[PDB]
Amino acid sequence: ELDSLNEKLKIEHAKKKRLFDLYINGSYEVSELDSMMNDIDAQINYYEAQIEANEE
Amino acid sequence: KEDELDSLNEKLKIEHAKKKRLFDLYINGSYEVSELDSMMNDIDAQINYYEAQIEANEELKK
Secondary structure, three states, rough: HHHHHHHHHHHHHHHHHHHHHHOOOOOOHHHHHHHHHHHHHHHHHHHHHHHOOOOO | OHHHHHHHHHHHHHHHHHHHHHHHHHHOOOOOHHHHHHHHHHHHHHHHHHHHHHHHHHHHOO
């Protein structure tokens, strides 16, 4: 279902914002952040692709 | 508050540390400036508040 994909999407966004908060508070090192950001970015792309898929 | 508000100065140093951490992101770039700028404004806002709080108390000494 589309909307099921839609809220899984904004969860990834929430993860992105939360991750930003964590680093700023000195919880993570720069190098790790990039990788974890890419991992989230990748999953967002997957979710987005699903939305582009169901055009029917 | 009975010299316990020296913690306020400590609370300031935290935001300053945050500022430096955020600047690391700016330097590396590739994180949307709009996203970084929003955080930058939030920190700058916190600094100014705490800064104003400090001078008020230091004034209240005499």
